[PDB]
Design a protein around this ligand. Structure first.
Ligand SMILES: Nc1ccc(C(=O)N[C@H]2CCC(=O)NC2=O)c(O)c1
Ligand SMILES: Nc1ccc(C(=O)N[C@H]2CCC(=O)NC2=O)c(O)c1
Ligand SMILES: Nc1ccc(C(=O)N[C@H]2CCC(=O)NC2=O)c(O)c1
Ligand SMILES: [Zn+2]
Ligand SMILES: [Zn+2]
Ligand SMILES: [Zn+2]
Lengths: 105, 106, 100
């Protein structure tokens, strides 16, 4: 019964029902090669994003997946990444919890 | 990809996914202390970059036959978990609080 | 590790004094669970009708036991057997352990 919206503009992005426990947990704290730290929640599906660039396997936080940057398709806020090319699931999203706002449908 | 664990507060090198240790079946144990704080602890055979403070205590030990010392990040002082000693097979290991770490490339 | 609580929300469920300790069992899909059996428990909500399907414990039917505080599935209540008539089989990995 709860949806996650872009914190910057309010667009609906994903749903609590779509939380996915990748490696056992839906929440992963991660750091990128530039040493930036993010708190990522995994969701099976999303809507309202815009994925940019071609998929890349380098430094993927999730083994067996390629990633693309995900922006809010409405306002352009960087909300996380889409992952593809694996199995069970084939694809999923890692969204930056602090850039979403959770709320009632 | 996601092979090294760092302190989430400051980036200090702490451990590695390769060093995770399944104690009693699982590397993950969820526990609470006398103050009712719940922790999701990951067991590691090895860790670095910590500062172990105090002398070991067996009081309230979550792990049978081990005494604990508090493990802080050696750089920033954040409480990252506990070192366990005095036990058997293994004698020693680390229990680190998963959400106080950040996972990332080597 | 004398009190057992819901790992998701902390609701008190049972205690080492009530234990009967791990049983390793597989569901029909061959997934591993570590079950602890307790003679007593509290703070659950038992839902639905008893079922004998794939019961791990010969002689007993099960009902689903949820955490009464947050609704997380913590295990099952077993009934209809003998010595004892009833008990709770809770999933070790869904519980948090700590002091009294
Ligand atoms: N110079 C940079 C800056 C940033 C990144 C960056 O954020 N990468 C992410 C992409 C998603 C992922 O799973 N893992 C990462 O490490 C990167 O790969 C190179
Ligand atoms: N007043 C307090 C507050 C907290 C603790 C505390 O976190 N103890 C931990 C230490 C590690 C352990 O295995 N078990 C615990 O229960 C404590 O022992 C006393
Ligand atoms: N979609 C399902 C259906 C059933 C189970 C499952 O764990 N069944 C248990 C019920 C208790 C028991 O004694 N034996 C079992 O095999 C499950 O894990 C998923
Ligand atoms: Zn937006
Ligand atoms: Zn630190
Ligand atoms: Zn609960």
């Amino acid at each position: 019964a709860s949806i996650f919206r872009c914190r910057q503009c309010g667009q609906t992005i994903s749903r609590r029902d779509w939380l996915l426990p990748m490696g056992g947990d839906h929440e992963h704290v991660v750091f990128n090669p530039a040493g930036m730290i993010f708190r990522v929640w995994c969701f099976s599906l999303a809507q309202g994003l815009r994925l940019i660039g071609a998929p890349s396997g380098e430094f993927s936080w999730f083994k067996g997946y390629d990633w693309t940057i995900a922006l809010c398709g409405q306002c352009g806020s960087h909300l996380g990444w889409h992952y593809e090319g694996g199995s069970q699931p084939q694809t999923f999203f890692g969204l930056i919890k602090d850039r979403l706002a959770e709320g009632p449908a």
